Each structure stands twice: as C-alpha cells, then as structure tokens.
Amino acid sequence: VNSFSGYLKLTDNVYIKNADIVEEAKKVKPTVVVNAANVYLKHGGGVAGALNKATNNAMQVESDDYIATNGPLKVGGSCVLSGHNLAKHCLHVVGPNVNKGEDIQLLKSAYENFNQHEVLLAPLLSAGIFGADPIHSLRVCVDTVRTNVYLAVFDKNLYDKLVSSFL
Numbered sequence: 339v340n341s342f343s344g345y346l347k348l349t350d351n352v353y354i355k356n357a358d359i360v361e362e363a364k365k366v367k368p369t370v371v372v373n374a375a376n377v378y379l380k381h382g383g384g385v386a387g388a389l390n391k392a393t394n395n396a397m398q399v400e401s402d403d404y405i406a407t408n409g410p411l412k413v414g415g416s417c418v419l420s421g422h423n424l425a426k427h428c429l430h431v432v433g434p435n436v437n438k439g440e441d442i443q444l445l446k447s448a449y450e451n452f453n454q455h456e457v458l459l460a461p462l463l464s465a466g467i468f469g470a471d472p473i474h475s476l477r478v479c480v481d482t483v484r485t486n487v488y489l490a491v492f493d494k495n496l497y498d499k500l501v502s503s504f505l
C-alpha cells in the first residue's frame with residue numbers, strides 16, 4: 339500500500355492522474371520524482387522549469403555543480419540527484435526532444451531508467467515541449483516500465499484523451 343490517491347489504474351504497474359506533478363510531489367513526498375530533463379540539466383520550462391521553480395532554484399544550483407563535474411547526460415540517460423522539498427530523490431531523465439530532431443526510438447531507453455526504482459511519480463517522457471505524441475509516450479511507458487509508476491498529466495483535455503484511447 340502507498341499514499342498515491344485518485345489514480346486510474348491502466349495496467350498491473352502503471353497508474354495515471356490529471357494532476358500538477360509539482361502539487362502531487364508536494365503532497366505525497368514520493369521517494370522518487372522524475373524530471374523531464376535535458377542533457378545540460380537546464381531547467382528552464384515545461385515540467386523541469388516548474389519543478390525547479392518549486393525548489394526555489396536549488397535544483398538548478400545542484401544541477402550546475404553536477405554538470406561541471408560530470409559533463410552532460412546522454413539522450414536516453416539519467417542521473418539521480420536530490421528531490422529537495424519535493425521528494426527524497428529526483429531522477430532526471432532525458433527523453434528525446436523532437437523539436438531538436440532527436441531519434442524517438444530513444445524514448446524506450448529513457449523509460450528503462452525507471453526500472454531502477456521500485457516506485458516513481460513521473461510525467462510522460464518527451465511530451466509537452468519535447469514535441470512527441472503523448473499517446474505514443476504512454477504506450478512506450480506501459481511496454482517498458484515494469485516498476486510501479488504514477489503518471490501525472492497536467493492537461494485535463496490530454497488526460498481524458500490518453501485514458502479514452504488507451505488499449
């Protein structure tokens with residue numbers, strides 16, 4: 339039993355809710371919140387910008403030190419950093435950004451990072467300003483992630499479309 343509330347169950351291990359991931363993280367304080375990161379961990383907009391703003395820029399400060407030490411992530415890769423006031427840990431995962439021409443096949447590699455964590459609160463990778471089709475992202479999620487994932491979808495209209503079209 340866990341504290342996630344109001345989720346629709348899609349499969350054995352995948353759950354979904356129309357929610358602001360920032361507000362959901364603040365309320366649940368999950369072990370892991372996933373950030374929709376880029377390779378430079380520059381959290382300017384979308385989910386990343388919102389998560390970073392909620393940490394009062396502490397996420398960005400920590401991220402800048404990470405990059406200065408380790409260099410950029412790979413598209414499809416991830417790193418574990420602090421969850422600050424939102425979660426124990428933040429798993430920064432880089433999905434391909436279609437608006438930069440990155441290969442959508444890398445979306446499966448991106449979701450594989452979730453399997454290293456038993457339970458996660460996450461957005462749909464490569465959705466929103468990353469330019470992929472969220473219906474496709476949900477399908478890859480369900481077909482790749484085997485651990486327990488609680489997906490937060492900000493847009494109510496999109497949430498209803500994702501549920502209604504789910505096979």
Ligand SMILES: O=C1OCCN1[C@H]1CCN(c2ncnc3[nH]c4cc(F)ccc4c23)C1
Nearest residue numbers: 358359384385388461465466490491492493
């Ligand atoms: O949700 C969504 O509908 C439309 C597309 N799309 C994607 C992109 C945004 N993303 C999110 N997912 C879950 N929580 C979120 N909180 C946010 C706060 C912000 F300021 C900007 C983006 C998000 C967000 C999924």
